[PDB]
């Protein structure tokens, strides 16, 4: 479960969620990558679910690189409460994925088995993906 | 004496900033016309209200 | 379910009080600040609250004092 060991402020404003990604648009570590074509929030629990389903198809073949990390925390008020009377409490940690950012990277395998591994990892995420390679 | 500006669209539903530019050109009613000599100062005014007036 | 926040202080109107190239009197205030964001140039004093005021009449001009610093001066008319 990815989460920072310490943060300065537990309660922060939600990210913008609109626009385009700043960096991480190319494949640098591995060979075959996984792009994103839709914007959404990727919870840390959805990362461990996709990482296990991916590295299992490759028993001991190669290495996987997680390129994102859940820095921003989100809050949620308890059940059966009216509006106001303060803010909520931390419930999880999210990231911001915009069209163009690589999510996972895989190396050490063949091209025919890299497509099947990155396919099972895309059904666990709430965004649409595209299989990409290293640029010439 | 070489430019004629007429008012086509109405000023209802327009920002107050653009209503002062039409008043500074001498266009009171709709479809009203004026004659002015071209210059950097008068040209920049109709460039602000381009979507409200047409120049011949 | 009470909170502990909600308190703030009154806003202190800081910043420039006179524009550039404007005629000022001999006791007008040019700048309110906390610290030294702008240094006192010639014909401009410095108050006990880091306020910048002018000593003489004339036009006020903002200049640059070296690298990453600036100052403000007052020159007499004509």
């Amino acid at each position: 479960m990815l989460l920072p060991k310490r943060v300065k402020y537990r309660r922060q404003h939600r990210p913008k969620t609109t626009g385009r990604s700043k960096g991480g648009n190319y494949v640098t570590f591995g060979e075959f990558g996984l792009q994103a074509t839709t914007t959404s929030w990727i919870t840390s629990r959805q990362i461990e679910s996709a990482r296990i389903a991916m590295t299992r198809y490759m028993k001991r073949g190669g290495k996987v690189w997680i390129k994102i990390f859940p820095h921003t925390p989100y809050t949620k008020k308890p059940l059966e409460v009216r509006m106001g009377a303060g803010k909520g409490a931390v419930e999880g940690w999210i990231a911001v994925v915009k069209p163009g950012r690589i999510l996972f990277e895989v190396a050490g395998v063949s091209e025919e088995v890299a497509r099947e591994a990155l396919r099972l990892a895309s059904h666990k995420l709430p965004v649409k993906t595209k299989f990409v390679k290293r640029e010439e | 004496a070489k430019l004629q500006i007429t008012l086509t669209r109405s000023v209802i539903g327009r920002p107050e900033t653009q209503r002062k530019t039409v008043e500074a050109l001498g266009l009171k009613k709709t479809n009203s016309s004026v004659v002015v000599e071209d210059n950097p100062a008068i040209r920049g005014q109709i460039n602000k209200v381009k979507h409200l007036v047409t120049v011949e | 379910s009470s909170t502990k926040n909600g308190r703030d202080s009154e806003s202190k109107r800081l910043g420039a009080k006179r524009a550039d190239g404007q005629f000022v009197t001999g006791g007008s205030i040019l700048y309110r600040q906390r610290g030294t964001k702008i240094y006192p140039g010639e014909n401009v004093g410095r108050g006990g609250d880091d306020t910048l005021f002018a000593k003489i009449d004339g036009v006020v001009k903002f200049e640059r004092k070296g690298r990453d610093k600036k100052q403000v001066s007052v020159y007499a008319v004509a």
């Binding site: 648009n25 190319y26 792009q35 074509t37 069209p99 163009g100 990409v132 640029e135 010439e136 | - | -």
Partner: protein, 93 residues
């Protein structure tokens, strides 16, 4: 294989650049020795073909200003979403 290129004068508006990236052309600039940053245009599919022959670090016999100049590709911008280039730089030797 040689880059048959044309020139564009004036200041190209934002619409014409979008219309240039759709007709199959790519803008480029030659800022070598004496060229004086001459803005130039080039085809898209004929650029991918020639760089495969000579390589990423090879010279090009580009024709700009109705004359031959030996230039190489210094750096280029790439849009990863639509797997195509958007701009080329030419550093003459």
């Amino acid at each position: 294989a040689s880059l048959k290129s044309i020139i564009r004068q004036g200041k190209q508006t934002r619409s014409d650049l979008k219309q240039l990236r759709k007709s199959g052309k790519v803008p480029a600039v030659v800022y070598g020795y004496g060229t004086k940053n001459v803005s130039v245009k080039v085809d898209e599919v004929e650029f991918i073909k020639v760089i495969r022959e000579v390589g990423r670090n090879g010279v090009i016999e580009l024709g700009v200003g109705s004359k031959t100049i030996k230039v190489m590709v210094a750096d280029y911008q790439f849009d990863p979403l639509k797997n195509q280039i958007t701009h080329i730089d030419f550093l003459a030797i």
